[model samples]
Target: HIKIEKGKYVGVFPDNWKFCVGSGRIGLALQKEYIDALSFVKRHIDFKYLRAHGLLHDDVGIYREDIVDGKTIPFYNFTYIDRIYDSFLEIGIRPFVEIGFMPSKLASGDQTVFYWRGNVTPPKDYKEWEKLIKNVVKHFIDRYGEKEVTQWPFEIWNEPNLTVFWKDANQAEYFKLYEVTVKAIKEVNENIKVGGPAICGGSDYWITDFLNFCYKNNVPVDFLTRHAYTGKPPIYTPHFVYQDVHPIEYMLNEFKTVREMVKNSPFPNLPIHITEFNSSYHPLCPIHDTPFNAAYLARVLSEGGDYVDSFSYWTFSDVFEEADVPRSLFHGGFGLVAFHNIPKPVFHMFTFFNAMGEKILYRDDHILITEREDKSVALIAWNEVMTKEENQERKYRIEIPVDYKEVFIKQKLIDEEYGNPWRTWIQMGRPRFPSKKQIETLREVATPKVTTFRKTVENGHITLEFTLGKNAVTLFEISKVIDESHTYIGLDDSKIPGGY
Candidate 1:
């Protein structure tokens, strides 16, 4: 039996786990599917911030330039932006705004990315860009109030170290952009947090350079932002092929490196926000829609907080279309919620982790046990495997010293045979477009299977046993059984010692 010392309190669980969730772009917030997805997630998860790309992109219709009487005139529109932010606040989600992907009117060149054609060039005029930034901030302040807007983080851009997102991946130009953008944000309200150089893997040198530039130029840097992915380079075809999947420890090491880098910087204690992260960098990789992803994410959600201030899971819903429109319901899209607002296996990972208690009783590679202030206990365990062929079952025997004569146990299981919807979809012949009835059925089957039991405590100790399958995540909650036998019963006035 694996003995858990009930009296030993390790420490409190970190709140960093609920920091943020993200999506393809803020523009998706306008879509009905996206709204439904966010609403569903909000109902289950208590995420504080939501981050996305293309807040200033043309799709939002934030900027317009026109020639009137042979003179250039600029006009700003807050209608769409207002709606997006309004919907977010409506669902108790706040913006972790990524101000990026140049507006057509302000871009120096016509180069862009994605089917949506978000212009990636540096602004043709820095002054105009600065004006746009300042106006957007002022409008948000006017609408949401200074206190609320200030709580929102203003990230500079998405993956500027990449050539596809930033012109030539020019480090100098990005530093200039960062300077101008930060100043513009500060101009509106100096309290607003803004940070950048949101680079990805193999390009982390940009962080040191960015810090140095900010220090030398006296630019305000509130937080350091970046992205991380576990898969190796993609092999492009009709569908992308991913061969290399690194260990979870590798990603954790990357986070550690980032923390050390920030600690050594001029601003030693500046917060590091991993604004985007997933198993595969490419959105179309099928690995995203599997139980393996869920188990892998459990480890990250459990450990990531130890290194970074926040790590926003990339793209909350499959309403995303960066590479192209998703081919099928289970086409490995990077979203907690699948197409048509169907919850994926990975979606439940966050839900399970977010539901953890405040007090951390014990934690290790395979399990995390927490205790509530009321003496209830929550135990979350996972068995993660890298490949499909590597299914192994791990049996856990837990012995905890209880404070009561008896305890009730509630266990929930999410694994290939239970909580996974993809398997059910395949069993139903993988319908290209499921009917309303089929969709409802899938939703029903997607919920984690739960079982309840009870154990008698002997010498204030109880023992439990269970086996975890590959790519399986489980939560076991224990609560003391109050003895109601001694509870006082209401009596009639004449039956009581003193009459009422």
Candidate 2:
């Protein structure tokens, strides 16, 4: 328990973003892996985050013809789209739908992003694209019904401004595509929601221009969306490309700016979604393994809880490969679960965030803290005062509003061991990579003793003396004091202040 002076304003996260993280390509490739993958996703329902159903891969004709040679190449067949659609229903997860990359046969041009180059150009045939859209909408209605499908918002292509996703595409060209997609979606089900112009970077006029077009042309836009990131690129880049930035802060500012832009517009109250946002573009930044990332996310959510409706991380697992590592099969980072779908430090952090009952209040600048009913207090303190390079502890005086009868503190200072304990548990004095069995054990076994004490107190205002190690977060829980004979705070009614 920490000391609290009265009337001081602590940052209050009035509403926690409905606990959601993204479930990506797995949605598109829900093959034999469907049963297992869906189960894995359910395990995290305790986390209660939303899933961004990914890469619909609806192009049919494009896959059939390969333009590589003069002769017609065999069309590519994607049988997995339906499997994913079924999974969405079975799992009962709402898809933050992402409409994207040109289907090969339908693509207007021959350009692509990563190695899995789904032709991203405009559909080779507009009519075919329209049919594809109609079929997709019909499938959703048939399976989930119009009532259910109407609830999901349809977003336009992801990151069309980037070279990898768009080919010789101008803002006007993309808007035209948006016009077709939105019109088609509304044509079938007027209640179906549609919005987009999802960009990769900061607040830009292009987004504003798109909004203007939507308003003027009477297009249906239920929400405005965009993506941003914090930290370095996942792969090695030029020295100049290495960006040492704070994504959460950058995103908060951007969201506010966009909100203001919309607020001043005709539709001032339109809801905004920070569709894809997270820390560390790079896998090696150790943001996941470290506590700073977790605490930073908490702070980010706390800061923007009111501005953004939903905060969706990029991916669910590390199965995704980075563009820079072409020769390498897979790269790490970007997901709550690692490549094997093993939970990472950030995963637990999310679980912890989800476990939090509800956000009552918090503070900016001093320390991380949360207050819950049932007379329990969760206090999280971190050392962000020190410069990024100067990894040092900072002193924080945490104050709890509720008076606690007894307080027990269980704290873990994030270090290498806190993240990968299985390796530590198996290699107790020897050196060995934790096998799959060992990983399972790590998943089931008890966590280690990384917490230490500075001093103990039993009375007065509950006070804790500890250090927020360089880029570390520590949590403490204070419960109502209980007595013998199963007596708690409300035990002695006659003697209690409130006549318990």
Candidate 3:
């Protein structure tokens, strides 16, 4: 049996995991399905901030300039911005503030990214860009008040290292953009923070270079940002995309690499925010909608927070349009909540992680055990296999210290046979367009299978013996069993008639 030593094995549980989350373009936040899904996530695990792309895109009508008479004129509108940002606040989430992709009127070229076509080209005129940034920040302060808006981090842009996300992917150009953006933003309210060069993985060169440029130019860089994903390139099909994810350790290693880089950089004390991360970067990758993805991220969430301030999960709802309107209900979208408000296995992973205890008791490859303020123990376990062919069931038998004689044991499991709703979708004939009844049936099938029992301690030790199947994640809770049977005299199940 594995021993649970009597001591605080680690520090407090990393609560920063919920500090920020992600969404599709801010424009999509206005849709019904999007709001419905976000509200559902909020009910279970509320996030402090929501980051999305296309905040400066033309669809929001944030920037409009026209040549009237002899001179040019500019106009800024906050109708849509006010609507979406307020909607976010009403749902208990504030904007993390991704100021991005040039408005069509301001963009210099035709270059763009995503099906929604966010103009990725640099601004045609830096002066106009400055005016736009200043006005947007000023408008936010005007609506939300400086004290509240100052709490938000204004990320300059998204993934400028990728040529698709930023035209040419020029480091010198991006640095200039950052310098210009920061100046305008601070002019509005210096208390509002700003930082970026938000590169993706395998680009350590960018992080060091970004820090050097910011410090050399006397920029006010408050934080570092990057993304982490375990998958390599895709093996695509007409209907779905396929990719293999590395073991969960692959992402943990990347998080630590950023930590090491920042610790040694000019911005030595800067906090790192992994603004986007998942097993697959592609939205339509089939692996995204699986119990395996839940198990894979389960281990990442257990330990990754030690190396980064927050790792925001990309696109919290499937009401996304990166690959255009999703063709199927189970399309490989990177959302914790699938369409129609069905909770995927990964949704439960976040829920379970949020409910964990404050004091960490133990951690290992497949399990993390913690204790609440009352000393009740809560833990998570998982088996993250890369391929179904290598899948196998595994067991864990451990001894947990306790002060009570009897305890209540509870388990919530997500495995192929339990919490996975995608499997049900496939069984339902992979319906491209699910009817209302089909959607209801899938939602009913999407929850974790829950089981409970009573455990009597022996010698002040609670022994937990459990088995995990391939790609399965389980959350366990052991609490003091408060028996109030004496309050109800002679209460017996045997005295009542049974359906059996």
**Candidate-wise lDDT, in order:** 0.85, 0.58, 0.87
Superior by lDDT: candidate 2 or candidate 3: 3
lDDT of 1 by residue, 109-216 (tens): 978998789999998899989888899889899988988989999899888888899889888898888889998889889999898878898877888888988898
| Per-prediction TM-score to the true structure, in the order listed | 0.94, 0.79, 0.97
Q: Which ranking of candidates, highest TM-score first?
A: 3, 1, 2
Candidate 2 regions with alpha-carbon error over 4 angstroms: 1-16, 26-42, 45-54, 58-79, 232-243, 282-292, 322-331, 355-359, 384-388, 401-404, 407-413, 420-434, 437-460, 484-500
Error of 1 at 238 (Å): 1.9
Q: Report the lDDT tens digits of candidate 3 across residue range 189-301.
A: 99888888789987789999989988886788999989899887779887777887777888899899889999999978899898998998888887889888998898778
- Model 2 deviation from native, Cα RMSD in Å: 6.9
TM-score of 3: 0.97
Q: How many angstroms is residue 141 displaced in model 3 relative to the true structure, after the best TM-score fit?
A: 0.7
Q: Best candidate per lDDT, number?
A: 3
